Amino acid sequence: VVPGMFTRQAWEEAVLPSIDTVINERRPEALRQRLTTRYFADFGNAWLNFLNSLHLRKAQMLSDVTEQLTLMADVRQSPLVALMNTLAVQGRTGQRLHGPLATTFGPVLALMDNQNNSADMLNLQTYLTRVTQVRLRLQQIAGSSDPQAMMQMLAQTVLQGKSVDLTDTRDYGSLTAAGLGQEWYGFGQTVFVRPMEQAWQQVLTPAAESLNARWRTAVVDGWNNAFSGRYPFKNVSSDASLPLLAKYLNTDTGRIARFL
Amino acid sequence: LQGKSVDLTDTRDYGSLTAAGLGQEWYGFGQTVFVRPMEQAWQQVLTPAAESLNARWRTAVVDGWNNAFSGRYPFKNVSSDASLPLLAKYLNTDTGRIARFLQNNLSGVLHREGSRWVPDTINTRGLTFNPAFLKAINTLSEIADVAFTTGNAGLHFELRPGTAAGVMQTTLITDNQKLIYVNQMPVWKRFTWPADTEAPGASLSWVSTQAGTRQYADLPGSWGLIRLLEMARRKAAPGVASGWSLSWQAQDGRMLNYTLRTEAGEGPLVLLKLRNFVLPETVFELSGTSAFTGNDEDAGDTVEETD
Amino acid sequence: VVPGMFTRQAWEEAVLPSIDTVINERPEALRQRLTTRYFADFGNAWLNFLNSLHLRKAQMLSDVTEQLTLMADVRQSPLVALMNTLAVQGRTGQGPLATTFGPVLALMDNQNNSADMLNLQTYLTRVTQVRLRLQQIAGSSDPQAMMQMLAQTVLQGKSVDLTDTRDYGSLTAAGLGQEWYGFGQTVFVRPMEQAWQQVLTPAAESLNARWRTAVVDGWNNAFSGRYPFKNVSSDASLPLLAKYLNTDTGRIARFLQNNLSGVLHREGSRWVPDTINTRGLTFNPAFLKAINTLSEIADVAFTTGNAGLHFELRPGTAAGVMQTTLITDNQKLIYVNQMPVWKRFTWPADTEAPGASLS
Known part of the structure; x- marks a missing residue:
């Protein structure tokens, strides 16, 4: 990460509902919203500079992207689901309605699945487990034949054909990504796409030297x-x-x- | 094994996701409730299907x-x-x-590769087959890529002049394509082996120093040239590229030599691999699990070429 | 054996002589002399115990499945309990660690800010992946066959996993600071190495x-x-x-090119075996000496795929010798002590009676 989030964490809306009112008397309600509006506008602006430039996903080298796809999908050791709960509880403490439209209609809506076709977080989280299912079956449980003989098969059936497990998860990782705002574009690029390119770079060079x-x-x-x-x-x-x-x-x- | 979406594959694809979708503590649990009641059907589907293809x-x-x-x-x-x-x-x-x-009965098992048949592309464990079948198809495809190139089943091969010792007028006929030889300058010629309509057959006739023509043996029938060539297989020769000679020890010690040069691989000597050749028994048998007999395809040609 | 008399985990019993060496006498560095020597015995009497660690042998297939599972299964993983015991007594300097438990405690959870060598959490996962494959061959599928069915994947199929699982033993004990703590990690490299020594040993008896x-x-x-x-x-x-x-x-x-590729790799005329995949594999030097003779023959004699070469020659002169010898395969060379010229030969000449002689 590159840090940010400077002294605007949601704790201080329990020890500063005071000092916004302290300045109202010396200088009452016409200044109160004038301070609250500027403060809440500088709230999401504080957090988007930490929530856009997260990083790349620490781009991994050969054959071991199966560990990352387990440390993104496992529910008791996720560094993603706990961060989603961080965004939920430290975004609601901004008062539900006056909790701003910046840090709400991005990643807070995607957590609560409606009973419909909303682009929830659980669907990408299940497709990630399917891709690391196939890749974990590829390497270690290559059934006495080489992984090369199946590496050539996957690089045959992605590149020219249609509808295998890898071509669809990256399709799913675009509607949830660019379906957010203009400000979470730099965020949705690096959680919802980049855990597919780290498999796409480690799937074709074994096939490239298997066709040999x-x-x-x-x-x-x-x-x-x-x-x-x-x-x-x-x-x-x-x-x-x-x-x-x-x-x-x-x-x-x-x-x-x-x-x- | 080769297609998609029957009731067997999808239940295991389902039994993976709910298993590995738990924590790292119920991994050992999810491995033995949600996957293992599919392997007990997978081990009891294919070995009856293994001995049904037989x-x-x-x-x-x-x-x-x-x-x-x-x-x-x-x-x-x-x-x-x-x-x-x-x-x-x-x-x-x-x-x-x-x-x-x-190409359709076991298309996921044997991929056509080069000219032989490679076995290790099943991506499957617990199923091996008889090595007799794998050799008896390789020999037949080696016949398929020497003699039969255009379906009409005919090869052609360069020919044999003579150099002898105390004998002259060495004559052979096959398929109305003569070779008369009276110790001239030795020059090759050309035989196509299945000819047009004729009296098809082959024979060898020489002239001794004290007697006239007496034919060695005449053999009739379109499958005639491969019969009389069998008799004198002292062959291997360090000369030309395909490098073969024939002895043909006829009667009373007069030996009449030749030197065979072939074009595509081995020519019409490879048709002598077919004697005592039966297409074998069962594929996919349980018996013969550990056997290393990958030397007969070298030792038969060892006995053939040196003797 | 011999863990000594560890004077640690009784740190209050040295608090009172930290005061008794100043107040009882009538200078402050006398506390600091013993403070720097408060962990000389810690830097000895814990360091010798880690080198006192060794293993117990397995020497079959099922004992490796028993021995290796006890190390990685986190609940009752007493390697992790031992590493937590070593994580208790070095957390403060007493961040930066003033004792020599510094680089060893960079393995427990170091919060690897770009010094991504290895975490102990990652290394234990690679042990379980080998446990799975070692359970597959033992899993009632004629293990005399499935072991070779695995053993071919190490050599010539050139699988994708083999670069990563072997190198963690190399990239931990080398990187674990002191060579003695690297020796304790050499006690914790071997359950990978003995496991592949178990797997690749029937590979010898099958490929031979x-x-x-x-x-x-x-x-x-x-x-x-x-x-x-x-x-x-x-x-x-x-x-x-x-x-x-x-x-x-x-x-x-x-x-x-069909059963020993991946380890044997053609480079010009010879094929010197050079990668990291030859570890746990020692070639018979009779073999590598013989097959470099039988590939330097194939650049003189049989360069066109079949038999045949070409070479020219020229005779000389001597006392009483005035003649010619070589007639080899019906291309004679005749000299009566005239001027010397070069004549072209061919060794496997087209004749019905080969031979040579002299005269």
Whole structure:
């Protein structure tokens, strides 16, 4: 974090309902709202400078984004759910109505799920557990085959196809993000999107070096087994067969054509 | 195993979320109420299904492969020979019946890779199969990628001049493509192995120093060239690239030599792999769990090439 | 054994001599002399106990599942109770810690502000992940097979987990300040290391069987007793050398790209085994010496995939010698002491009767 929140925590609305009235007499109600309005306008302005620049999510290196997706989704050790309760109870102590429209209609509404299609916090919190379900089953419980053979499968079915577990959680992490104000844009960018890019950066480079190790058993051995030491590749007497080479270098039916 | 959304996969996908959606203290609880009553169905679904594919496989293609090719030549040494173009429906790469059994009946189990059949892409544990099947499909696909390139089932291979010792006029005929030889300058020639309509067959005839022509052996039938080539397999030669020679020790000590050069892999010598070849029994058998027999495919060619 | 007579956890009993060394005599550094020497015995008589810690052996599969679970399962995890015992007596300097429990208490919960080496909370999770896989093979799926079914994933499949689970033992005991507290952490590295020593030990007894079968048997049944191995005059066999010792399609060049990749890695002519994944794996130096001979042959003899080379030569002159010898494979070179020139040869020449002689 980068700190902020300077002496405007909601405790001081229990020891300063006094000094706003102390200045009313020396200088009564026409100044009272004049102080209360300026103070509550400088309230959310204090907290948005701490609540926009949180940070990146401390971008993680190889293969161990499964730990972060458990320390975002677990209910008794969450550093997110407790922060949501912090925003609830230190946002209501601003008096429900005169608790300002800044620090209410952002993240306080998303906590209380209505009995409808409201973009609640619980749905992204369940989809995060599904993505770390698939990724935890990928690495450790690769069922005696490599994770590479499934890494290539996921990087096959995301990039060109439709509707797998990763393509939908990032779709869900945009309507709750940009569905907030102009001021919580810098907040909704870094809790609701960035725990998907930290899986997207650690899903495709194992697949990128897995397509290699499948490519040197799919067609390279079949191409260096028939045409190894014949004429038009190494200057030896005997020559490579003409009609067998048509099964590799065609444009629609050959194996090199049926690999790409 | 290969599709999506039956009643088995979704209940386990449900049994994961409510289990790992608890704390770190009820992890050991949620592992044994919500997931483990699916593994006790998963262990009792597939081994009856493992030994059912056996009993479908010995009525789908094995009886078809032993009904047409039962007692003919290149599997048991009888006179009459197995028909050539009917075999092209059983050994093609993409349209034959064996090629149309391993693309939809177990498509998540054996991926077609190169020319052999790689087993370790099941992503599955607790299910291994007979190594006899995995060798007996690899040999057949090696036949599929040497002889049969265009479906019409014909290869062609370069030819043999002679260098001899005390014998002249070495003559061989196959499929009305002559080779007469009287110790000229040795020059290669070319044989296509299945020819057009003729009297198809093959024979070898030499002329001794004190007697005229006497033919070595004549063998009739379209499957003729592979029969008389069997007899003299002292082969391995350190010369040309495919590097083969033939001995053909005929009567009274006059040996007439040759030197075979093939084009695509091994030529028509690879058709001698088919003798005593039966498509084996069951796949997916429980027996044979730990066995390392990955040396016969090298040792058979060791005995073949050196002797 | 021998935890000594720990003079700590009785800190009130040294409060009264902190006053008795000044008031009883008639200078303030006499309190500070003993205050700096209040934790010399703490820096010895706790430091020797952590190095007094060792392990108890497991030496089977199920004992590793028993031994390793007791360390990570947080309720009744008496490693965490021991680390809390060590977290009790060093929390104050007496932030910064004036005693030498400084770097050890950077493991308990240090609030890792960008010095992200390792927390003890993270390290215990990687122990449970190994417990899960070690429970899978023991979990009634023919464990003589599933252990090898795991053991192939370490070598050649190049799994994604193997970079992280091994390196936490390296990146904790090295980074744990004193080498003695790193030695106590070396007592707490080994349950990872002994676990992978348990897993990768049947991998040796399986891969030695498969390498005895797939190359060595077809080698010795074919090539033993010919000329260039045992000095006899029988049965030169050339073109099987280009089927074994070839560069790309030979079976020895197949075995190194289908079952021992990830540890063996081709670099030019040789394949020196260099990564962090070779830890817990010691190569027979006979093997690495033999297969660097059988890859430097494949850059002279069989460069075109089959047999054949090319080389030229030139004779000389001597006393009484005026002649010519080499006729090798029907390309003669004749000299009667004329001017010397270079003639082109070929070793596996196309003839029905190979041989050489001299004259």
